[PDB]
Ligand binder design. Structure first.
Ligand code: CL
Ligand code: CL
Lengths: 219, 5
């Protein structure tokens, strides 16, 4: 979905949405496109093990340094293991081959609970299918300005370090959710931002997002 | 380790 996201971002940015006589950003809001999933917490222990994270439904996962992923559902028992080549297996906490990674996941779990806030804690996620499988973390990287997190459902999340603003890009709905410095949040359809425009801050973050999606595609 | 807020 990265190629689609790149096309959507190229389109919104070419419209120069902040270079307008009157920006009407509010008219581009569409609260129904709020995501089902985003990353609420993360821990970069890549010096040793990998990147642990929590999704907004309170499930957790780890992308290990060997590019494998282990996800624990919010039921506290169900696991999905994803190999480097993408092969998926469904297991429970209740194989010996995964004992070490399960232990690491629990420790990441505990650390996130002990030390970190839940991003978007005040946001009601969109309701989807209670029985659907969780997305997992495909890859991530850190720049001067942000951490970039790409989920297997196509979503790309960019969390900015300086002001704690966050972008969640959802290419299936061609939408973006923006969490601002005050933790207020809005969801926009990118096509409506073309129509109505947006402020320089959001325009800058959307240019930055396209740069990040290009980096993801280059990786 | 580095981490979120
Ligand atoms: Cl612009
Ligand atoms: Cl909204």
């Amino acid at each position: 979905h990265l190629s689609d996201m790149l096309q959507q971002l190229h389109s919104v940015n070419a419209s120069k949405p902040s270079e307008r006589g009157l920006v009407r950003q509010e008219e581009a809001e569409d609260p129904a496109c709020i995501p089902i999933f985003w990353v609420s917490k993360w821990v970069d222990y890549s010096d040793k093990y990998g990147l642990g994270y929590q999704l907004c439904d309170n499930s957790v996962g780890v992308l290990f340094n060997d590019s494998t992923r282990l996800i624990l559902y919010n039921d506290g028992d169900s696991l999905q293991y994803i190999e480097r080549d993408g092969t998926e297996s469904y297991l429970t906490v209740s194989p010996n081959s995964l004992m070490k990674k399960i232990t690491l996941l629990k420790y990441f779990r505990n650390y996130m609970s002990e030390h970190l806030l839940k991003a978007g804690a005040n946001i009601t996620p969109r309701e989807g299918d209670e029985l659907a499988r969780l997305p997992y973390l495909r890859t991530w990287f850190r720049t001067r300005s942000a951490i970039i997190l790409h989920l297997s459902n196509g979503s790309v999340q960019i969390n900015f370090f300086q002001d704690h603003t966050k972008l969640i890009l959802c290419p299936l709905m061609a939408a973006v959710t923006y969490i601002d410095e005050k933790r207020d949040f809005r969801t926009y359809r990118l096509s409506l931002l073309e129509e109505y425009g947006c402020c320089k801050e959001l325009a800058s973050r959307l240019r930055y997002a396209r740069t990040m999606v290009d980096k993801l595609l280059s990786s | 380790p580095l981490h979120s807020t």
